[PDB]
Amino acid sequence: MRAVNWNKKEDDFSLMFWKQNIAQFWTEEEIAVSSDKNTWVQLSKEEQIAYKRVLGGLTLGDTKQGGEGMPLVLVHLENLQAKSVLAFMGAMEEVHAKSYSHIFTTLATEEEIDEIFDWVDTHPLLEKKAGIITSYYRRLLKPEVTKKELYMAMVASVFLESYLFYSGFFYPLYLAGQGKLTASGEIINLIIRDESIHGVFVGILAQQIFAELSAEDQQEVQKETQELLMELYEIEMAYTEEIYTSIGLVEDVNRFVRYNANKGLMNLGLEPKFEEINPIVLNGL
Amino acid sequence: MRAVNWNKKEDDFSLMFWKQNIAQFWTEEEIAVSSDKNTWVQLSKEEQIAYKRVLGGLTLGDTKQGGEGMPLVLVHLENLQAKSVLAFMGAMEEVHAKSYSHIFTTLATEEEIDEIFDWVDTHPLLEKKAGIITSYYRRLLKPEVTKKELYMAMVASVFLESYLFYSGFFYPLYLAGQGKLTASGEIINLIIRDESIHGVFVGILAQQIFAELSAEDQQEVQKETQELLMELYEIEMAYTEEIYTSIGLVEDVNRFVRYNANKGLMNLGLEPKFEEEEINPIVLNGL
Ligand SMILES: [Fe+2]
Ligand SMILES: [Fe+2]
Ligand SMILES: [Mn+2]
């Protein structure tokens, strides 16, 4: 039975991503959030509700990535150095999720926080979203999995990290780019800096598995990938309408979703499927 | 579908274990090992071989805890705050495994390192040891596991972290306690500081699962736990005989194993089963 030997490369990229993930390490206590109170109170009820709802959605994403996606992808990898990177990423997913609670503690009361997490748990669209993603992970709860199933779990992971999350990062970046909630915005940037290299690395692993598949299996997962992409897109369009109508940003957010879906596709080595970033969001980055 | 909410406690201990794990975070770049070359050459061939073999075994343990053990236990936990802690511990298992490679790069040539890992991979007793433990994790590869299966996987994890590893930490500690390989010894101590709180935490979770089981299931896993304990112990005594006969430490290591088995049992809330020794005083100096 093999132990991980870092003095013999198993691939050309794992050491680089290991070092980078380590270099980027951070935790919530680093960023103080209290000074955001001064711009929080200037927002409207509907804006505050939107912000709280998108942050609850982001927490759910990271909860599922740290507690389901990374563990079940990594346990079936044969490459022990890549496993190590994915284990570290999974731990950072939990740092992300905890950092949203740190923001909430400054911006909401205990009763309001419970209202957020109750709303997250019962929201039909969030349930549908996460349910579709996690169903690819649940296929991996058996002793022998096919490479098609592992490929598609990696596709689902890239789509969550690089794509389905970003309907949620839009609003924190949009406010930070206007100089509102900028401390919370520095936390979201740290998170994004992690998610970016997460999606890149899982996408590299996906392309390596893909190249081992037979031609018939390649055609089957390409079809499933394109379908999943547009299935999630449909649901996200419904989610964005529900969250952002009240504050006039539905069509901006949808443009941000399409941009990030294209990024996700490219992390997988695939061509873009939708035809620039909102300039205020760009300033928040 | 629930998201983790750290502003409402799911239990009394996960927050403090989260904070402690973060506080203790470290990586291999933080300890330079080159200065160990001076005492490395003072060792015999047989002592050097022993040291490389036990670090090979340690690397294997951490490889399996990070890549199988923590992931498959945490995926089935319902407590989301406890899941967060196990995920962070799993990542630290990978830092541990990499830190052994950092030691090897200084102490062994490229071909000597290959020999270590080939020896690790083909060793009958290490395969039997690791195979018994990972067979409890493999049971968790299905959509719905029972709490007996989950409990027994947690027992296996505590036995690996708190007990079956220490046949291996003995020799780095013993040599550090004699002034040899002390920078590698600082690394081993960092690892041990992690492993201690890992075993405590998983043991708390085990105890909580145990109290949820039916009486009939409790009786079943209580007996399996004691059988597993003594099955592993028999294998570990064969392992220690094979590793340590050449350097005359077999019975010293066995005392250390029994001491750490008792600690594992206490992490699980069980009474000790081996006679109470003092830790070897040279090992104690290495700590
Ligand atoms: Fe991520
Ligand atoms: Fe451990
Ligand atoms: Mn994430």
UniProtKB/TrEMBL annotation, chain B:
Residues the record lists as binding Mn(2+) 2: 93, 161, 195, 198
Ligand binding (Fe(2+) 2): 93, 161, 195, 198
Known catalytic reactions: a 2'-deoxyribonucleoside 5'-diphosphate + [thioredoxin]-disulfide + H2O = a ribonucleoside 5'-diphosphate + [thioredoxin]-dithiol
Residues that, per the record, bind Mn(2+) 1: 62, 93, 96, 161, 195
Residues engaged in binding Fe cation 1: 62, 93, 96
GO molecular function, one term: ribonucleoside-diphosphate reductase activity, thioredoxin disulfide as acceptor
Any one GO biological process: deoxyribonucleotide biosynthetic process
EC number: 1.17.4.1
TM stretches of this protein: 150-174
GO cellular component, one term: ribonucleoside-diphosphate reductase complex
Listed InterPro entries: Ferritin-like_SF, RNR-like, RNR_NrdF-like, RNR_small, RNR_small_AS, RNR_small_fam
Protein name according to UniProt: Ribonucleoside-diphosphate reductase subunit beta
UniProt organism field: Bacillus anthracis (anthrax bacterium)
Gene symbol of the encoding locus: nrdF
